[PDB]
Short mmCIF file of C-alpha atoms in Angstrom, two decimals:
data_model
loop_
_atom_site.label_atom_id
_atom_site.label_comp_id
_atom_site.label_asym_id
_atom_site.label_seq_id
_atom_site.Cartn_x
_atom_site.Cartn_y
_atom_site.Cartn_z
CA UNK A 1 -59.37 37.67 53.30
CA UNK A 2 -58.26 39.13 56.49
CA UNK A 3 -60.48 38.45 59.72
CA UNK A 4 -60.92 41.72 59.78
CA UNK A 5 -62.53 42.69 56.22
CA UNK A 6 -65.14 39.94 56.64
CA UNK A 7 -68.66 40.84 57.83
CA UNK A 8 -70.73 37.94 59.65
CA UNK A 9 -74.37 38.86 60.11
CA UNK A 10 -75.36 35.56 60.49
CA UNK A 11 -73.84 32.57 62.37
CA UNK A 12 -72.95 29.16 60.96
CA UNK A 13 -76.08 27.86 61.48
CA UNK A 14 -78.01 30.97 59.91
CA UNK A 15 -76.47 30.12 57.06
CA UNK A 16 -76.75 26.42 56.36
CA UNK A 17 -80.34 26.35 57.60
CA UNK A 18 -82.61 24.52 55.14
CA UNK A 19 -85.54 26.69 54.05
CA UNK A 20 -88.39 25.69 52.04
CA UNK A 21 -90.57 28.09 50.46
CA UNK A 22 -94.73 27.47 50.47
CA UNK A 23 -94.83 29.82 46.98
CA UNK A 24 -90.99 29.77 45.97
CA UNK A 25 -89.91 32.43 42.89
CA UNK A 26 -86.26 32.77 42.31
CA UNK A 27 -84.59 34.53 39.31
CA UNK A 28 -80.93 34.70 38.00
CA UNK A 29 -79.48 38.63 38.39
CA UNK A 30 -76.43 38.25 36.61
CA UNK A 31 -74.08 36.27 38.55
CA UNK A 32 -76.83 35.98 41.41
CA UNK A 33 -79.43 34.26 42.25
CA UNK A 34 -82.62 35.32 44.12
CA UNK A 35 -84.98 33.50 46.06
CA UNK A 36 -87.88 34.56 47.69
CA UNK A 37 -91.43 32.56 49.55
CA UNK A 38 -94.36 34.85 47.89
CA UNK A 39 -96.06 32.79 50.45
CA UNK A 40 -94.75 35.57 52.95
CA UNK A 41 -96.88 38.73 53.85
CA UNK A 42 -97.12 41.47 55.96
CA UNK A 43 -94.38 41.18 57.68
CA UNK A 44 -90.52 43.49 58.94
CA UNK A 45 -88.29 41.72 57.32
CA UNK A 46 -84.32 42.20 57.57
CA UNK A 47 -81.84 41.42 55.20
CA UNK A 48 -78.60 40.21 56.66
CA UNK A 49 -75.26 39.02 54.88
CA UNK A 50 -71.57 38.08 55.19
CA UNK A 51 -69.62 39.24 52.86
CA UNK A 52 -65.59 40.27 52.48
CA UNK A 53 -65.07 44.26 52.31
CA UNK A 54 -61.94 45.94 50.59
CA UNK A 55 -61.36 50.10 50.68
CA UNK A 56 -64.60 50.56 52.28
CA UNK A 57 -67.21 48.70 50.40
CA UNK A 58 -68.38 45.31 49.89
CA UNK A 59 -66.14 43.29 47.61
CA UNK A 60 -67.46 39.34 47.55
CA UNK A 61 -70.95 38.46 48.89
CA UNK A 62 -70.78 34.54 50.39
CA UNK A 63 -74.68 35.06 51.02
CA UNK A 64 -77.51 36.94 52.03
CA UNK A 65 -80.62 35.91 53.83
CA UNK A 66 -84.10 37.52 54.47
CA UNK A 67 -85.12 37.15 57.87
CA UNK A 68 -88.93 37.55 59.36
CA UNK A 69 -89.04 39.12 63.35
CA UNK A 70 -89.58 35.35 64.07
CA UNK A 71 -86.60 34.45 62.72
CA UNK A 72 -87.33 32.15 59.68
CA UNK A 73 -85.36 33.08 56.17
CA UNK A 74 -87.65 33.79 53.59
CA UNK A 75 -85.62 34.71 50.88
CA UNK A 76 -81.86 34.52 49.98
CA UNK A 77 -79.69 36.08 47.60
CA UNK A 78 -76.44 33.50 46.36
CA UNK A 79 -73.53 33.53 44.29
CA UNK A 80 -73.79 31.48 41.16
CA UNK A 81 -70.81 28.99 41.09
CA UNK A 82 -70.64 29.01 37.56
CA UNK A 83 -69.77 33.04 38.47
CA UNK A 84 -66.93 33.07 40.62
CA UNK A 85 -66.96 36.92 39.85
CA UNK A 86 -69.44 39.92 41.00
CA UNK A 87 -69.16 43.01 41.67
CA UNK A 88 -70.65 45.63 44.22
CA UNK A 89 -73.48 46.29 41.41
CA UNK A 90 -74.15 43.03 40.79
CA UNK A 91 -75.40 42.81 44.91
CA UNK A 92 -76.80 46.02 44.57
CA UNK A 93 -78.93 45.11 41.69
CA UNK A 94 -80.23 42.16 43.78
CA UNK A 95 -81.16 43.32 46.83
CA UNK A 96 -83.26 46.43 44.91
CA UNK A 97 -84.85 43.22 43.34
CA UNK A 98 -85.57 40.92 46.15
CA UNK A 99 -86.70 43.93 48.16
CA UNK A 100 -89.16 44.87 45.53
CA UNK A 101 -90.61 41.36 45.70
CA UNK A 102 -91.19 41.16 49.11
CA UNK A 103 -93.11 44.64 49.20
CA UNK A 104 -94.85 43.13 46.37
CA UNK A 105 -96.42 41.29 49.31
CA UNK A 106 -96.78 43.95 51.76
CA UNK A 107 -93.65 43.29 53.57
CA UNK A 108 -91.72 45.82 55.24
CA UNK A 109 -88.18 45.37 54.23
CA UNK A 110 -84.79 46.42 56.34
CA UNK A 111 -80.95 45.86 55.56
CA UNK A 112 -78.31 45.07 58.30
CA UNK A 113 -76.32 48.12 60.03
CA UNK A 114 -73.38 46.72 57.97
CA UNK A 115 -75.23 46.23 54.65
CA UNK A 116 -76.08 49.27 54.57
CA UNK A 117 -72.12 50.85 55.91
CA UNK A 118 -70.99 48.54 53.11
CA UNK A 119 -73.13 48.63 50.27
CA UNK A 120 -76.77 49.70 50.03
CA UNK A 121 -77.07 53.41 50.85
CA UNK A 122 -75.93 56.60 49.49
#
C-alpha cells in the first residue's frame, strides 16, 4: 500500500510496547481480537490505530491501541492471523465493543482525528 493510504497514529515503539494487564479480558470479534485491563477506571482514554485506507475509508487495520492521558495502552484491538481478511465492519464492530468495556469502568473513551475521518463516525 502506497505511503500515502497508510495512517500511523502511533510510532514504532507505540506499537511493539509490551503491556500487561492487572485484570486482562479479551474476546474474539470475528477476525479480531480485543483486549482490554478492567483493572483501568476513571480515566480519557483515546483510541489510536494504523491502518491502510482505499476510496476513503479504512481498508486493513495492522492495530489499534487504547491509550490513558498518561500514556500507557490499556487495551488493543488485533488482527487474527488465522484471518488474513476483515472488513471495515469487522473494526467497526470492535471498537463499539472495546469502547463499551472500558465505560463499563467509568472510562471516558475518544477515537483518533483519523479513526474517526476513516471509519467510526457517520
Amino acid at each position: 500500500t502506497p505511503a500515502s493510504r497508510y495512517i500511523t497514529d502511533m510510532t514504532i515503539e507505540e506499537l511493539s510496547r509490551d503491556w500487561f494487564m492487572l485484570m486482562p479480558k479479551q474476546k474474539v470479534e470475528g477476525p479480531l481480537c480485543i483486549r482490554i485491563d478492567q483493572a483501568i477506571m476513571d480515566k480519557n482514554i483515546m483510541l489510536k490505530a494504523n491502518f491502510s485506507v482505499i476510496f476513503d475509508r479504512l481498508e486493513t487495520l495492522i492495530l489499534l491501541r487504547a491509550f490513558t492521558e498518561e500514556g500507557a495502552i490499556v487495551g488493543e484491538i488485533s488482527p487474527l492471523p488465522s484471518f488474513p481478511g476483515h472488513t471495515i465492519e469487522d473494526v467497526k464492530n470492535a471498537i463499539g465493543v472495546l469502547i463499551g468495556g472500558l465505560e463499563w469502568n467509568d472510562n471516558t473513551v475518544r477515537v483518533s482525528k483519523t479513526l474517526q475521518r476513516f471509519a467510526w463516525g457517520s
